Amino acid sequence: GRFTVTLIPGDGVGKEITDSVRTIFEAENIPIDWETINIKEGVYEAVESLKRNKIGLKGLWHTPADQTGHGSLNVALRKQLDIYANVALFKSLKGVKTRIPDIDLIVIRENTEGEFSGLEHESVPGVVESLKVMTRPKTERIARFAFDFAKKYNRKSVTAVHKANIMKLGDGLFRNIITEIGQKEYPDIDVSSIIVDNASMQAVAKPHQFDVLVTPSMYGTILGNIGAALIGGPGLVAGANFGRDYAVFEPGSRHVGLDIKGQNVANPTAMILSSTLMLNHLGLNEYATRISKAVHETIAEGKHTTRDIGGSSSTTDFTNEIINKLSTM
Amino acid sequence: ERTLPKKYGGRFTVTLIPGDGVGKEITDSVRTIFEAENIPIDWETINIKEGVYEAVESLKRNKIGLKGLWHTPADQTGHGSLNVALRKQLDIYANVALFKSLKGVKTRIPDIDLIVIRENTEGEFSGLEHESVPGVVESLKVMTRPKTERIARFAFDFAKKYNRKSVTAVHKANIMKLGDGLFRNIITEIGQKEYPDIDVSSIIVDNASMQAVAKPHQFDVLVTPSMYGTILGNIGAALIGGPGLVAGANFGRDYAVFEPGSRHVGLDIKGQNVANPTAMILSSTLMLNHLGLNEYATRISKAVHETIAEGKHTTRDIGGSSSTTDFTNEIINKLSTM
Amino acid sequence: ERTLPKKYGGRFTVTLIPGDGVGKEITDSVRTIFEAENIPIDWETINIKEGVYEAVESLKRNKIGLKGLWHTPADQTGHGSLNVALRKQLDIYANVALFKSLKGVKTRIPDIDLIVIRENTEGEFSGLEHESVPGVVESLKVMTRPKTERIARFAFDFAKKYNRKSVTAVHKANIMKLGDGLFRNIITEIGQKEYPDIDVSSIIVDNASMQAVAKPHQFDVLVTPSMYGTILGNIGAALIGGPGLVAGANFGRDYAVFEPGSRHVGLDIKGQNVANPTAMILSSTLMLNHLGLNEYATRISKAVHETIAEGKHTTRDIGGSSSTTDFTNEIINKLSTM
Amino acid sequence: QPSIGRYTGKPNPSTGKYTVSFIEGDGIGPEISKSVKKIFSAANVPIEWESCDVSPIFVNGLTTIPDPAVQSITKNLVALKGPLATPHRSLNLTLRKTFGLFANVRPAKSIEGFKTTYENVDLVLIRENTEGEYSGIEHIVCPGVVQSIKLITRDASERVIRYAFEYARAIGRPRVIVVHKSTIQRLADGLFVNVAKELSKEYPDLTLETELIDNSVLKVVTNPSAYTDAVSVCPNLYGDILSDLNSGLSAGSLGLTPSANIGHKISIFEAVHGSAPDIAGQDKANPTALLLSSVMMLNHMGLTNHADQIQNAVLSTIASGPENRTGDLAGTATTSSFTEAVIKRL
């Protein structure tokens, strides 16, 4: 009866935001045991762990921008487990002031390919080429995942974001394969395309027109952050990563919060909500349905909410309001 | 690998087709036992006159399915099986029915274990017929070497995989010398030059029917064309207790659909919660073994096997007084203590 | 069987592509020897800037072809091989060149018998290149496991079929560790777990080039990517006398095109009737053996073999003074008395 | 004005005026165009219009641009094009390649008297329009495998990043932000960033910051004003997206957005909206877009006083009062009435 899930706190507010979940978990006496790991190339041990347990819950690691820096190792984790599908959930929350309200859109991105393929070289000094790979197999895969996902969660529309008018082969292939296999399979769903730049403009100005968006690695980071802002911030976004065999759940917004590490100011809504996603996954979800209502009501209920939403409470206090509301359900 | 069964981070997505009659109840029994065992599968479930399309289309995505039986009209303007439509359109050409008697069940001849493999897409199920002049009707029965070599090998492969020693071809080749002749030859022919370790033999369908009812222990595996399989099937169904105890599965090259091995709709007792889900559950376990789970399968089969062996609390048709609901819960109960 | 070679009541229909340079003359030599031997094949013969389409389309009908070489520009607005175009578009991925010395020919190192198998569609022949900024050019060389496993097996299969004991992979894996590395591995890798009876080894292309020129008898069969095969090929061509003595053939799954193994156009001596058809004829015999004739092949090869061994009456480049015309007729003559 | 794309003035000695190529373009182009010619006339701009046609030839299958227009535009070192249709080699592309245009300047500022969801948005972005993701280089490496190649060079980067420092200086913004993703594009984006960091030093009045698109998009949408002292420089793709995004924030579409395409000695100033073929002739178009590009042009030429005149007053101010405005901004006015209503406060 006891799952053994992998826990990777990671850098920045990672350590605090994970703890929030632990506390809410043992306070709800959820039958899961954390195997928890900490780390330069022991990204090996994260992989190896997840390969045993199959399921994980993680924050974000930090990534250098300097030349002798190590390289994502957030992507390393995904590539090495072929957790190829990222899902981010941008649904606005009741107790949060946002410029455009009542917004509900999903962004599915491919994790292992595209501009995240990390192939680059310098031919002669001062001239650099970064190669962006796009392959039919990896693309058919994500395409079906997206539609399957849209069908499973009764989403009516799926839109492919691309730049196929300029990168006619790369993004072209992507746009075709998606629309192509949304027509001869999944005919019940509305497939369409949109050019990444124009998509970016509609997203900021008129987001309600979008339902599900499928994108290559890059465009997903971009539309992702638009969506993150649209609903309040990176602290409200649940996320999950799927491969065929494994599943790793992380915040849908993908920010480390390095600056506020150890300050107990951080917001765990993101972590907790994607933590609920994980419960639904491994079948629990009585708990998930539960502890989501807890945080949803907590933040809707004015003060006692955390700094970035407009409150004055600390991570610690916000957590305890959830566990409190939870103790009376 | 866009050809394995739908799976996302450890979770299979299987097709569920409850279908007509006790279908809806008998499927539910499985759902309940499944979530109560927290099995990592998610049902994509479909309901339906020609949306037999949507069943096909679904199975083509997921590759795997679990279904009851649909109902079929006998009137002239009726629609046509669409149980067979499903199979023909997916070329799920091989049907396996498992007739193994169960401990807690009174049967006239006990300790019986035989398998009936039938071809699904051809034979008398080819559905070609016409009326030349009024009152004269011809039904054409097609038999082709390719479709026949296929089932022949499936049968032997199956017998080898599950350590079955004997394979017998049921036919009427003494009368339909070309049709059933071809069938009998191709089977025995390729059980001799491949699969030499297995005992191949023939038997005439009528005489087979007689031995089956009188002395069934002489049979191991039976390979038949569409019709003879329906007939020997029901003999076997009766021999072990009834249609509610028979696990079944259908195989094509790419897809697999699991259904009850006896093939009865139970229209009359729909919604009465009197029905017996042993059939559905047991073939449901067959599906688990298939998509590799089978720790669960080994598990939840022992559950139902012990449940029915253990006298009362068993369902109406086996000789008990419990409802589908109650029988299910005894399984989930026995299961919660394993 | 819409996949065997075009054949109508005993008569094959083969594709004939004379091509540029001595092509037209050297092909004719074969025609003449063919009708003079009354060989049951009919030429569908084609001539051509982008009608390399019509060559492909023809070969797709007939499956088999016999061709010379086309010419290829070196200028910037030139069209591009279209010898490779033919092969890439038919996925005729395997080139075989036969370097076996001939009795009546003065060569610096005698009694030499080695085969060079090269991959046709990939490597440095992938023809992917671009200029990033002015004056900086990148040519991309593709190497893929599938295309490489393919040629690897072809080579071993070939070596087994023609009782060749040794197969050596030529590479530059010490520098291009991924590209040529993959090639060297996949070859040795699948010469060890399949084809264990054959001696697999590697050799670095530059060092291979040196041994080939100095001590060629140490080699049996050589497998190479597109480039190294052109290089070792020409070494072998020289070793035995010249480009006019080398039989060649190209293989895919479905099609087969036979051409000279040395791959020179002879533009300079076009129409002079000085050219040597040994190459063309000998690879023409290879084609006969292929489409099963080969009584003829065994025949007309002995003809040319004896003709050239028998001193004068041989063609210019071997050391004779005869013309293509005269050499041909000696073959047809020797042939008329067999 | 920025040293990098410097206008070489010289008014035509026979007239007091400077020469500028027009390119009315098609669709609403003509009407939107003479709308500008009139407003320019009224303010006494030292400018005579030499309109030319960029309808493409096809020398060597590769689309070329007509000699008439080439000579005209290379001569007068400046041009002002309206929108044109989609006539075998992007028309806009062969336009940059034949005139050496390398930098897209895209401002997005809130408009007075037109309410959109985002407020106090005043944004400036310079985009590399030469290389990056948008070099023609892509390859089919085998059956189901494609490579699109992103090209980043110091030479191309240097001269954009310069124009950005120099433009930031020319409009009195302290900060200049290099948008990048050195995180996973170490070499490519890394080079861009280093080139800015190295140039940083010979522009000590400006402060250089570096930001991941991650944050550049997150932060701008949460709060547009945090970049009202901006000027952001970035490689071709990030630029193409962020600029179309910025416009989405400022106006919700891009019928108000002006662009400037700076080349070494030439420079073209255009509106970024389409040809709006269905509203063409009926006098409903909205010159504001092109009109603001005119201002951009004025400043680039040195005619500060006129630019500030036509912008600070006029249009910007006449777009206040719904009797003015156009159909696209709730207004009721025509292209006709907008132009005279403008010239009044001109």
Ligand SMILES: Nc1ncnc2c1ncn2[C@@H]1O[C@H](COP(=O)(O)O)[C@@H](O)[C@H]1O
């Ligand atoms: N736990 C958190 N709660 C709220 N906001 C966060 C959290 N972590 C990160 N952020 C925001 O995301 C940004 C971090 O992005 P970066 O600069 O890429 O590290 C900061 O500006 C924070 O405002």
Ligand SMILES: Nc1ncnc2c1ncn2[C@@H]1O[C@H](COP(=O)(O)O)[C@@H](O)[C@H]1O
């Ligand atoms: N799922 C089932 N399990 C056991 N027996 C059944 C089931 N469905 C129908 N039957 C029996 O079979 C008879 C009707 O069969 P059918 O041919 O399906 O209508 C009824 O008298 C039932 O007793």
Ligand SMILES: Nc1ncnc2c1ncn2[C@@H]1O[C@H](COP(=O)(O)O)[C@@H](O)[C@H]1O
């Ligand atoms: N039929 C032939 N027999 C022998 N050598 C030939 C023949 N045709 C061409 N050559 C030689 O190959 C060279 C032409 O090849 P290439 O350099 O590709 O034009 C010439 O220098 C000739 O000496």
